[PDB]
Amino acid sequence: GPGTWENMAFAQDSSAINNINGYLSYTGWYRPYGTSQDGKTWYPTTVADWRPILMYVWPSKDVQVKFIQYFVNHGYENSNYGLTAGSVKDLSENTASINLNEVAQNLRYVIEQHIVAAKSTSQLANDINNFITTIPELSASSELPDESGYGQVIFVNNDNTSYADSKYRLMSRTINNQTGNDNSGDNGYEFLTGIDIDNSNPVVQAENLNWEYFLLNYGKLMGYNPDGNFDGFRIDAADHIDADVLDQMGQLMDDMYHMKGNPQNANNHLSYNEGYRSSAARMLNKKGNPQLYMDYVGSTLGNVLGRANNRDTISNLITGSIVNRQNDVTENEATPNWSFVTNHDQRANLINGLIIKDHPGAYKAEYANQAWQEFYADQKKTDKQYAQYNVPAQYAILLSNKDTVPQIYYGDLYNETAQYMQEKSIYYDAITTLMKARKQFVSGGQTMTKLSDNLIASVRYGKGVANANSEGTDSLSRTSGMAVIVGNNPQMAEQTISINMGRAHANEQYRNLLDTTDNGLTYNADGAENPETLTTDDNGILKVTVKGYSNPYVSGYLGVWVPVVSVNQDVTTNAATVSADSNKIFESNAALDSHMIYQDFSLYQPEPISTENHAYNIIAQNAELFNNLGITDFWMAPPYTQYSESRYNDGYSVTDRYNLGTNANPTKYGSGEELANAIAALHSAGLKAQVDIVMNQMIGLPGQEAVTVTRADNRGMQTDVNGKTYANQMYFAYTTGGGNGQETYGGKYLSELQSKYPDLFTTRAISTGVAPDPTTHITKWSAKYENGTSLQNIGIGLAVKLPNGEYAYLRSSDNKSFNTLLPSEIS
Ligand code: NA
Numbered sequence: 001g002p003g004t005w006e007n008m009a010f011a012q013d014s015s016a017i018n019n020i021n022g023y024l025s026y027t028g029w030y031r032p033y034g035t036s037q038d039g040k041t042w043y044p045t046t047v048a049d050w051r052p053i054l055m056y057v058w059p060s061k062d063v064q065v066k067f068i069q070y071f072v073n074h075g076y077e078n079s080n081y082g083l084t085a086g087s088v089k090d091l092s093e094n095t096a097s098i099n100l101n102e103v104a105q106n107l108r109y110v111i112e113q114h115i116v117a118a119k120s121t122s123q124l125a126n127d128i129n130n131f132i133t134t135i136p137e138l139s140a141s142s143e144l145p146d147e148s149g150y151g152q153v154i155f156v157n158n159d160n161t162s163y164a165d166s167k168y169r170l171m172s173r174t175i176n177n178q179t180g181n182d183n184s185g186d187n188g189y190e191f192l193t194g195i196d197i198d199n200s201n202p203v204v205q206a207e208n209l210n211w212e213y214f215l216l217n218y219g220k221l222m223g224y225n226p227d228g229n230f231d232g233f234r235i236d237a238a239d240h241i242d243a244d245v246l247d248q249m250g251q252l253m254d255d256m257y258h259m260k261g262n263p264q265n266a267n268n269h270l271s272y273n274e275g276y277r278s279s280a281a282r283m284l285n286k287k288g289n290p291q292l293y294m295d296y297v298g299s300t301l302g303n304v305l306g307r308a309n310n311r312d313t314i315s316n317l318i319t320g321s322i323v324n325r326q327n328d329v330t331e332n333e334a335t336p337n338w339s340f341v342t343n344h345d346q347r348a349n350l351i352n353g354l355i356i357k358d359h360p361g362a363y364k365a366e367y368a369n370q371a372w373q374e375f376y377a378d379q380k381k382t383d384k385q386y387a388q389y390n391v392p393a394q395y396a397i398l399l400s401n402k403d404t405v406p407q408i409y410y411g412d413l414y415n416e417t418a419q420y421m422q423e424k425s426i427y428y429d430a431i432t433t434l435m436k437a438r439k440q441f442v443s444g445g446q447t448m449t450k451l452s453d454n455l456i457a458s459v460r461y462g463k464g465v466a467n468a469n470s471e472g473t474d475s476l477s478r479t480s481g482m483a484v485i486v487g488n489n490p491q492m493a494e495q496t497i498s499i500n501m502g503r504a505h506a507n508e509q510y511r512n513l514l515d516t517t518d519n520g521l522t523y524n525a526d527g528a529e530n531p532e533t534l535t536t537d538d539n540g541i542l543k544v545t546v547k548g549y550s551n552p553y554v555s556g557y558l559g560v561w562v563p564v565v566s567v568n569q570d571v572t573t574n575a576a577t578v579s580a581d582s583n584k585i586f587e588s589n590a591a592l593d594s595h596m597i598y599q600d601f602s603l604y605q606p607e608p609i610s611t612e613n614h615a616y617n618i619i620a621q622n623a624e625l626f627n628n629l630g631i632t633d634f635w636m637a638p639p640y641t642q643y644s645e646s647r648y649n650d651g652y653s654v655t656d657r658y659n660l661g662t663n664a665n666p667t668k669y670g671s672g673e674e675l676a677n678a679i680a681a682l683h684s685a686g687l688k689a690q691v692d693i694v695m696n697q698m699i700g701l702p703g704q705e706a707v708t709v710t711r712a713d714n715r716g717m718q719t720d721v722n723g724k725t726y727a728n729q730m731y732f733a734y735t736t737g738g739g740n741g742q743e744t745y746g747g748k749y750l751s752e753l754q755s756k757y758p759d760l761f762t763t764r765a766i767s768t769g770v771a772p773d774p775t776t777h778i779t780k781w782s783a784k785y786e787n788g789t790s791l792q793n794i795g796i797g798l799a800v801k802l803p804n805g806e807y808a809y810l811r812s813s814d815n816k817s818f819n820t821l822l823p824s825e826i827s
Pocket of ligand 1: 190192196197697
């Protein structure tokens with residue numbers, strides 16, 4: 001017959017009870033055998049009638065009382081069941097168990113009334129979520145965020161979560177701590193954000209090689225445009241992943257394209273690593289430079305020229321880089337690097353900050369339109385507060401700098417929040433003019449001479465001219481080279497300066513390529529203090545008039561002088577097929593200097609309002625434009641499928657590593673078909689394409705897994721957050737996903753890789769002393785292949801523990817470790 005025995009779960013399996021690897025949650029729901037609204041009549045539940053576990057079971061009698069008090073005070077009161085503000089206000093943990101259970105049961109009758117009345121379990125679900133916030137232990141605050149609202153947990157071994165155990169999880173094995181013999185050193189930390197991937201696990205190291213091979217043959221393998229294949233990689237968070245994968249990538253690329261011997265093969269398959277840690281340059285040089293080091297001159301440029309106040313001296317442009325350019329007259333000595341003006345987190349770190357100013361640390365509703373309108377408005381002004389000063393001047397330095405592959409930002413050529421390449425920025429004309437000038441003029445040795453604290457003269461001596469004294473070996477020697485004068489003081493006094501152009505440029509006329517005026521810059525010398533053409537003296541000295549200007553384009557001075565010519569000229573050095581050093585992959589020389597990278601995306605790039613607006617489609621239309629500007633290499637956005645609730649949909653919140661978009665379901669950039677056509681369009685114009693490869697993290701994995709966690713710092717060592725900490729805690733983290741792409745293409749090309757390139761899976765990795773393992777294919781990511789996750793806003797108190805101290809467990813289909821053990825109220 002009927003009774004309170006029907007609070008029992010219909011059956012004790014996954015069919016009737018919510019569980020994550022057999023373990024119950026207070027957020028979790030279950031199907032009781034029967035429910036009741038009065039206490040007299042009990043109706044046997046159907047498989048449509050589920051109820052939350054927090055109605056029946058609680059962590060402690062304190063929370064049982066607080067659950068009763070909250071619900072009653074939030075419109076679940078009924079004096080016909082002795083439930084009113086007053087009747088439940090005096091109850092505490094010291095109240096009798098036999099008493100509280102009567103009140104909790106009487107409340108459970110009143111909740112069943114609301115479910116019928118409201119005709120759903122939606123307000124109940126809403127009220128449970130709101131109650132959990134009031135209880136500090138069940139709340140999302142229990143996982144201990146730091147003062148900045150950030151943090152991370154590490155996945156550790158445990159008897160309860162033995163499936164999620166790992167022999168590896170070698171954390172912060174980065175740069176020069178690959179061996180783990182300087183954990184406290186200059187290595188770079190493991191955790192950034194999202195679910196951190198364990199790149200120390202040999203199976204994951206094999207999956208990375210599979211993933212690289214897929215991208216290097218994307219067009220052919222997917223049956224799209226067969227020339228739609230990536231030639232290299234932009235390596236995301238290279239300083240925050242086991243450096244074994246940087247070695248293994250270098251091995252694969254050398255095996256496939258034979259780059260070690262031939263600089264031409266090397267340069268045609270360009271790879272560059274995100275991370276400016278000086279230890280990275282040291283590490284890469286020692287290995288023979290498998291990838292290009294990220295230079296920090298972009299930070300120097302923003303400090304010297306970029307700021308409104310507090311501008312660092314002009315001499316920092318000489319020394320504030322991995323390469324010293326006081327008198328750089330040598331080749332194959334400088335660290336092979338890739339530099340820029342606009343840092344890759346710069347726009348984000350400015351726009352974010354402009355939000356928390358407008359709305360002070362308030363809930364993040366998308367008023368980024370406001371922040372961007374403020375940015376665009378500020379950008380046009382002379383007296384800027386937010387946007388960079390001297391943007392043209394910063395690029396003039398970058399594009400004239402020897403021993404670097406310069407990288408242009410899409411957002412500096414175009415308004416990056418407008419539809420892709422619809423609106424040019426005010427700095428388009430300036431930067432594009434300097435870009436074309438680079439291909440024609442910029443070559444030979446470099447000398448950056450300080451004329452004052454605020455003024456500098458960066459001179460290039462032209463192709464086949466080693467230094468100031470050189471005659472000139474090449475036939476373009478005489479009619480190539482450049483002088484880039486940059487003042488960072490807008491109240492600098494009018495004065496005449498002397499610039500040593502070199503012995504090869506004695507009694508030679510020089511065109512006024514670019515000069516400053518009251519309004520901005522002039523390309524025909526109109527408005528400037530210097531005429532269209534000046535001639536050098538007998539010793540090759542140029543007399544230039546300079547003064548301090550203050551306009552939207554220049555806060556100081558900018559002047560560029562190139563030799564007078566009759567013809568189109570191209571000072572690109574062709575790479576040899578026999579290297580000076582056979583130990584090296586990449587060498588900082590005229591051949592590598594001839595290259596120029598282009599970041600083809602912004603984070604704040606908008607969703608396309610049609611197929612024509614797809615970035616891939618527009619890139620394919622303007623392949624020859626990029627070629628005209630002198631762009632050789634194309635850094636393409638991470639083209640992977642994204643977390644639907646990601647802020648930007650930028651590509652770094654990767655949900656499927658092999659799904660690059662379909663005709664019906666494209667990314668923000670477009671479909672895989674369009675990507676392949678975009679890559680082929682660039683290839684057609686003699687350009688190469690590098691893919692943004694995100695081996696560090698994955699974000700938005702929909703499958704939850706019961707994992708054991710410890711609150712750790714961003715290196716993976718346990719940390720104490722304002723006195724509090726926790727280790728060996730149950731955590732229902734989102735660990736499991738990958739999509740059909742990881743399922744379909746997961747370790748599917750390892751057979752082919754092992755047949756053609758056996759050395760890949762025999763070569764012992766430094767961090768493990770063990771080769772990558774291709775015997776297991778990763779078709780679905782889980783905790784076992786992960787170091788940890790950034791705090792997921794869930795809490796550490798959800799795991800249901802019985803009065804005896806043991807976790808509540810179910811012996812489900814796959815869940816079969818220990819014996820079934822449910823709370824008293826659910827059996
Ligand atoms: Na990492």
